Amino acid sequence: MLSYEVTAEGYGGPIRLMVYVEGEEIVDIEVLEENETPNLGDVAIEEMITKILEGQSTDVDVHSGATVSSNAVIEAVKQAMAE
């Protein structure tokens, strides 16, 4: 099982995730660092990790108040899933 650290540019500055892969199964995604806007961006991240793990897919909807945080997570995970 592969273990990649990915970083993409969020709304409040870069975010850093740990993505865990097993074949093409996304096993997990931990947040190592985010400094997004409390009660908005941090929430969008938790939500997007949930969507992606449940959906086993990065073709999922943004959290609508927070497209920039949402796309950061989508983009970070797209990077890890091309390996």
Author numbering: 1 to 83
Authors' own words:
The asymmetric unit of the CbFMN4-D1 crystal contains two protein molecules. The CbFMN4-D1 structure consists, like SaFMN3-D2, of an anti-parallel sheet (residues 1–9, 14–22, and 25–33) and two α-helices (residues 38–56 and 67–83). Hydrogen bonds are observed between the N-terminal strands of the two molecules. The dimer interface appears to have resulted from crystal packing. Tyr11 stacks on one site of the isoalloxazine (analogous to Tyr14 in SaFMN3-D2), while Leu40 is situated on the other site (analogous to Ile45 in SaFMN3-D2). Additionally, mostly analogous hydrogen bonds are observed between the O2 of FMN and the backbone amides of Val68 and Ser69, the N3 with Ser69-Oγ1, the O4 with the backbone amide of Thr37, and N5 with the Oγ1 of Thr37, while the O4’ of the ribityl group has a hydrogen bond with the backbone amide of Thr67. Both CbFMN4-D1 molecules have a covalently bound FMN via Thr67. The structure of CbFMN4-D1 is similar to SaFMN3-D2 (their Cα r.m.s.d is 1.7 Å) while there is only 18% sequence identity. The highest similarity is observed in the FMN binding sequence motif. Structural elucidation of a domain of this flavoprotein revealed a similar overall structure and binding mode of the FMN cofactor.
